[PDB]
């Protein structure tokens, strides 16, 4: 538990240290997207040829 | 090859197959030589009331 620190260290001025760990961190990482081989598909349409009676 | 054997050259007619890009072909009206009736199902919607259609 967190409370025993109060007896041992007082739990003061620590807060910023905890903040250092807890805060979100971000930086742009560029990269690749890859995976195992997968299914894919396709649809092609032709020219609609003029028909007559 | 200048030998008495029976051999002669032969050229096969193909098992014809065709494809047609153009509009240039057509099938006429259908005729039914014979017909047997497998099944029939009948139904109706009754809508007496004015509004709900």
Structural class of chain A: mainly alpha
Task: State the assembly state of the protein chains.
Answer: part of a larger assembly
Rounded radius of gyration of chain A (Å)? 32 Å
The interface involving the most residues is between: A-B, 4 and 4 residues
Q: What fraction strand of chain A? A: under 5%
Count of helical regions of chain A: 2
What separation lies between the terminal Cα atoms of chain A? 88 Å
Principal-axis shape of chain A: rod-shaped
Number of strands of chain A: 0
* Percent helix range of chain A: 10-25%
- Biggest beta sheet summary of chain A: none
What are the secondary-structure elements of chain A, in order, as H or E?
HH
PDB class: toxin
Keywords: pore forming toxin, concentric beta-barrel, aerolysin
Entry title: Cryo-EM structure of aerolysin pore in LMNG micelle
Chains A, B: Aerolysin
């Amino acid at each position: 538990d967190w409370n025993w620190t109060i007896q041992q260290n007082g739990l003061s001025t620590m807060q910023n240290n905890l903040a250092r760990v807890l805060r979100p961190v971000r930086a742009g990482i560029t990269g690749d997207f890859s995976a195992e081989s997968q299914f894919a598909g396709n649809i092609e349409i032709g020219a609609p040829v003029p028909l007559a009676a | 090859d200048g030998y008495r054997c029976g051999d002669k050259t032969a050229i096969k007619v193909s098992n014809f197959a065709y494809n047609l890009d153009p509009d240039s072909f057509k099938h006429g009206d259908v005729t039914q030589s014979d017909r047997q009736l497998v099944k029939t199902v009948v139904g109706w919607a009754v809508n007496d009331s004015d509004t709900p259609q």
